[PDB]
Design a protein around this ligand. Structure first.
Ligand code: ANN
Ligand code: CA
Length: 123
């Protein structure tokens, strides 16, 4: 879920509060998304959004009422390395992977403050 993703991003980037630094950034980082990504970080979020859209189409995810933002899964952080647990079922695992790839993406690309709270009229 959302809380897991927060800790997952702090695992890769120890000095930030993901819910603040990465929320409402560009056209995709944050609830929703549309238009052409403004930068790679925004592209990281785009991919993450597609990943979620994909997960929602899994027979295994449809059975449960939990939302990708509200579905708790298991993972660990160790030596700043993220590991999705094998105790996770199909749906959770898929989501866990979506969040893992996004966290790493976040930590490998530039951050442009100018894009924080971007005017959704650029999307
Ligand atoms: C806490 O950071 C994020 C970043 C991107 C996504 C999103 O697009 O909703 C969610 C949370
Ligand atoms: Ca989004």
């Amino acid at each position: 879920a959302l809380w897991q993703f927060n800790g997952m991003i702090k695992c890769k980037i120890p000095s930030s509060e993901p819910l603040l630094d990465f929320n409402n950034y560009g056209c995709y980082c944050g609830l929703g998304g549309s238009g052409t990504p403004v930068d790679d970080l925004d592209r990281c979020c785009q991919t993450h959004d597609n990943c979620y859209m994909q997960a929602m189409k899994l027979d295994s995810c449809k059975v449960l009422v939990d939302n990708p933002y509200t579905n708790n899964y298991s993972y660990s952080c160790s030596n700043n390395e993220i590991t999705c647990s094998s105790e996770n079922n199909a749906c959770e695992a898929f989501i866990c992977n979506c969040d893992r790839n996004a966290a790493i993406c976040f930590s490998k690309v530039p951050y442009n403050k100018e894009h924080k709270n971007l005017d959704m009229k650029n999307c």
